[PDB]
């Protein structure tokens, strides 16, 4: 057991898009939740299924650090049940979800004059993303009956859209970096723990 890489998932440089939501499997290390709850610098920081206080006395099989960027006004959907354009076609959290949602404002990084179109999101998907499902299909959404087979026009829509992150946008339209932590409960050896190193 060692210390986990939270200084990389959070203190990162480039972030993925919501439809292509990143993920980093964490195992073989005893974490350090101090920098996370004592942070006080995030905007949205809630845990569903466990109190951040009683985490250092807990151990886990694996920890999943899903990280992506969405406009702040949409962080409300990164939570169980909560729906919308992000929880339906981009990233859906299960009802029995047991983890934490951590997000912070980042327009000082992901907002370039004229629009930092590096971040995208999904507009159409015939299927609502099943809990943790991924829809990175670039297939032209066939709006109408006549197929598309290529470039768009009517009845043909490029399923992805962009984010015009400008440093002057509204407090809600600004980009926010999210981190969704998942916790694994398996009857197998546990390689993740909090300051509970007395059990190895």
């Amino acid at each position: 057991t060692n210390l986990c890489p939270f200084g990389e998932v959070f203190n990162a440089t480039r972030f993925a898009s919501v439809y292509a939501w990143n993920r980093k499997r964490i195992s073989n290390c005893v974490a350090d939740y101090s920098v996370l709850y004592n942070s006080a610098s995030f905007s949205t920081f809630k845990c569903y299924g466990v109190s951040p206080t009683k985490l250092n006395d807990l151990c886990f099989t694996n920890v999943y650090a899903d990280s992506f960027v969405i406009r702040g006004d949409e962080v409300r959907q990164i939570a169980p049940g909560q729906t919308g354009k992000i929880a339906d076609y981009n990233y859906k959290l299960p009802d029995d979800f047991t983890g934490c949602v951590i997000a912070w404002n980042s327009n000082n990084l992901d907002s370039k004059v004229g629009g930092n179109y590096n971040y995208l999101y999904r507009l159409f998907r015939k299927s609502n993303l099943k809990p943790f499902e991924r829809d990175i299909s670039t297939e032209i959404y066939q709006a109408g009956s006549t197929p598309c087979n290529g470039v768009e026009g009517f009845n043909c829509y490029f399923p992805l859209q962009s984010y015009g992150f400008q440093p002057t946008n509204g407090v809600g339209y600004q980009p926010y970096r999210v981190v969704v932590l998942s916790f694994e409960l398996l009857h197998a050896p546990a390689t993740v723990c909090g300051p509970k190193k007395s059990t190895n």
Epitope: Y37, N38, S39, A40, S41, F42, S43, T44, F45, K46, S51, P52, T53, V75, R76, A79, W104, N105
Partner: antibody
Framework: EVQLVESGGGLVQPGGSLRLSCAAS????????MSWVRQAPGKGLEWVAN????????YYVDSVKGRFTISRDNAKNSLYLQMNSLRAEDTAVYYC????????????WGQGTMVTVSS | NFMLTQPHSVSESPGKTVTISCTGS????????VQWYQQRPGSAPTTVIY?????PSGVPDRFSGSIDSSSNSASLTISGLKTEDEADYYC??????????FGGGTKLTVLG
């Protein structure tokens, strides 16, 4: 078992100094965020200051910024609040409260000491 | 400029159930945990609900915390009311811009 006792309150006319102090007893003091929450008589509760569990970073309401100095002492299980250049608005009952982490949970509340500011 | 708004007084009979609302002004509840502190007259506050819906050790089942996903507001519901529950209920939370904010308080009166 956990208890918090505050002393040092009283009466002072506008502009004078005063120093509140809280006596912690019952928990691993070196593991909680200490905050001062004041409540004017007949009014609601209003947070005032919050010092980190290791004395690193302190926070205050903009009302008292530049005049109130929160300060803790882990070894002596104590928390202080130097109230220099007091105003009449500051008249309230000050309580010392325990946090644990940043987001919410003002766990326990001492009985608090009264601070009256009237010339 | 993130305030917490709360009604002044709510009154209900002994056995019935009452609900106290806590709406969020410029800002957004449900983005952070919500607490509910009970303050009987002349006494220091006690925590009845912490982390939007958890009752501490010793708080009766009568107290329940809910965090509305629609109207941007959390609500405290004291079911099967007791005369001892008459008190002042304040709701608190945290925001990145404005720090720990409290509600205006509600005087829950158990009609006698």
């Amino acid at each position: 078992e956990v208890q918090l006792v505050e002393s040092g309150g009283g009466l002072v006319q506008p502009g004078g100094s005063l120093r509140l102090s809280c006596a912690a007893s019952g928990f691993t003091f070196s593991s909680y965020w200490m905050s001062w929450v004041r409540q004017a008589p007949g009014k609601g509760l209003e947070w005032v200051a919050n010092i980190k569990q290791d004395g690193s970073e302190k926070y205050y309401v903009d009302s008292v910024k530049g005049r109130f100095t929160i300060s803790r002492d882990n070894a002596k299980n104590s928390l202080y609040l130097q109230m220099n250049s007091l105003r009449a608005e500051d008249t309230a009952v000050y309580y010392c409260t325990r946090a644990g982490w940043v987001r919410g949970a003002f766990d326990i509340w001492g009985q608090g000491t009264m601070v009256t500011v009237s010339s | 400029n993130f305030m917490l708004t709360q009604p002044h007084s709510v009154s209900e009979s002994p056995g019935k159930t009452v609900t106290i609302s806590c709406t969020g002004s410029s800002g957004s509840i449900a983005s952070n945990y919500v607490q509910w502190y009970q303050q009987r007259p002349g006494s220091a506050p006690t925590t009845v609900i912490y982390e939007d819906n958890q009752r501490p050790s010793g708080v009766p089942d009568r107290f329940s915390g809910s965090i509305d996903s629609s109207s941007n507001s959390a609500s405290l519901t004291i079911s099967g009311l007791k005369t001892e529950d008459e008190a002042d209920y304040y709701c608190q939370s945290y925001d990145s811009s404005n720090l720990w904010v409290f509600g205006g308080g509600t005087k829950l009166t158990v009609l006698g």
